[PDB]
Amino acid sequence: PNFSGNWKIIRSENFEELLKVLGVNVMLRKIWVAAASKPAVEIKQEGDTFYIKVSTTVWTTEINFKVGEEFEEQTVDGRPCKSLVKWESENKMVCEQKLLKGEGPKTSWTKELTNDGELILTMTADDVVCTYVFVRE
Ligand SMILES: *C/C=C(C)/C=C/C=C(C)/C=C/C1=C(C)CCCC1(C)C
């Protein structure tokens, strides 16, 4: 259970479907998936304090949290939400998100390290689950 490393993608699933539920319309979804279905992820872990950097070609997102401590970040479609992370096993954590403003689909994410050394990220919007699978560089 050391999440730390520089992670690269081997697999991704249902990302466009996720964006549809989030209300991103067609041309935008098609364009987006043709250059954001290969983001890089960097994690530095310090106990249950996490630093996560997620980057495409021209955009980067910085997430900082302690497990069990409320913080702020964005939904996938760039919307301000309150977040809370909890452990579900030794190698898996879960985040529940609430919008600061307005209404929208219920969103969440999970992070899991397999024993094979795969980092599995899921993002969920109502009934849709998008899964990204990473290995270490
Ligand atoms: C523990 C790992 C976490 C919290 C990683 C979360 C990653 C995302 C929320 C990625 C979001 C993306 C966008 C917001 C737009 C570009 C496509 C993604 C998947 C990189």
Task: Report how this structure was experimentally obtained.
Answer: X-ray
Using CA positions, which residue lies closest to atom 1 of ligand 1?
Answer: 111
Q: Cα–Cα–Cα angle for 82, 58, 104, nearest 5°? A: 30
CA of 128 to the centre of ligand 1 (A): 15
Q: How far apart are CA 69 and CA 22, in angstroms?
A: 26
Quote the ligand 1 centre to 43 CA distance (angstroms): 12
CA atoms of 54 and 85, how far apart (whole Å):
17
Tokens encoding 18: 């996720």
Resolution in A: 2.5
Distance from the CA of 101 to the center of ligand 1, in angstroms? 20
Residue 57 lies in domain = 1-137
Distance between start and end Cα atoms, the chain: 17
Beta partners for residue 74, in sequence order = 80
Q: How many residues does the chain have?
A: 137
**E-assigned strands of the chain?**
5-13, 40-46, 49-55, 60-66, 71-74, 80-87, 92-99, 107-113, 118-125, 128-136
Residues framing ligand 1 (Cβ under 6 A)? 36, 39, 52, 54, 56, 63, 76, 109, 111, 121, 123
Biggest CA–CA distance in the chain, Å, is 42
Question: Using CA atoms, how far apart are residues 23 and 17, in angstroms rounded to an integer?
Answer: 10
CATH number of the domain enclosing 26: 2.40.128.20
Are the C-beta atoms of residues 129 and 14 closer than 8 Å to each other? yes
Number of domains in the chain: 1
